[PDB]
Amino acid sequence: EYIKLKVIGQDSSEIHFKVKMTTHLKKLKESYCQRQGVPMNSLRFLFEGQRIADNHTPKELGMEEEDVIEVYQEQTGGHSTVC
Amino acid sequence: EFPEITEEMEKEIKNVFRNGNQDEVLSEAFRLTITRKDIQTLNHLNWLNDEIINFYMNMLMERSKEKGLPSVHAFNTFFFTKLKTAGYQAVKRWTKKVDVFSVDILLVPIHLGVHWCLAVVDFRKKNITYYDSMGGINNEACRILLQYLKQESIDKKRKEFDTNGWQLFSKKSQEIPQQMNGSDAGMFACKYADCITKDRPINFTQQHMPYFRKRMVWEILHRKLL
Hints:
The complex is a heterodimer.
Chain A: E1 3-8, E2 14-19, H1 26-36, E3 43-47, E4 50-51, H2 58-61, E5 67-73
Parallel strand pairs in A: 1-5
Antiparallel strand pairs in A: 1-2, 3-4, 3-5
Chain B: H1 7-16, E1 25-29, E2 32-35, H2 36-40, H3 50-63, E3 72-74, H4 79-85, E4 105-111, E5 116-122, E6 127-131, H5 139-157, E7 167-170, H6 185-197, H7 209-221
Parallel strand pairs in B: 3-4, 6-7
Antiparallel strand pairs in B: 1-2, 4-5, 5-6
Helix pairs in contact in B: 1-7, 3-6
């Protein structure tokens, strides 16, 4: 209820959520990824840099009306090439 | 030292490398989670993912609290890419509630699409050091981090960062152990950082990597560095 958030993908696309201040963000994450057609484990939800756990709440993180949740994908690596 | 992997350590490691729920949480700390999927990237010569790296970096940070060790703040592995592609403005809020100028060492793990390197800011030595286990030079990363320090000082401390005495360099292929396979870049990054945060010379080679992978599985499971 208490706040509207923007979840912004690293491709610049937005999904708006209305969420309760004391509710765990797990359902938000699972909605986003479900909506995106991708598995959960491929994604990483940051709020101003801080990794958002399944038991994090908007209140805990100090989020305000119109705040932004950024989505990042997994990063893997092993060696560099020629270029 | 190179402490031994014990019998029960082996039993525990082989255990989490097994088949199972890929999303099953196996270790939890720093309000982060490490799943069976994540652990698998330490298996054989699999490519380490961001979860392993960030988690380990956080363990280094925990350790750094002890007497006789330099204090450490480790940025997460998305930081540098975001600073580079968008500017300071996109990352300034990532350090509300952290004062980067009050620790000795900043660890900056760097993801380059298919490869891992490490940048380190050492306020004691006054230099920004880049480390590539494949021997590449990246002075632009160092410059970017200097520019970051300038801006972070204005924004968080309302004064100009003193640039006097700072050196920006990349470790040469022959000054740091190099990798010899197409997979261990993440492992070098982590172990480079392990030594550095203990203030001890880098004392390993590619030869120790399968030992380090197996060991890391354990140290992550028990959230203790050996």
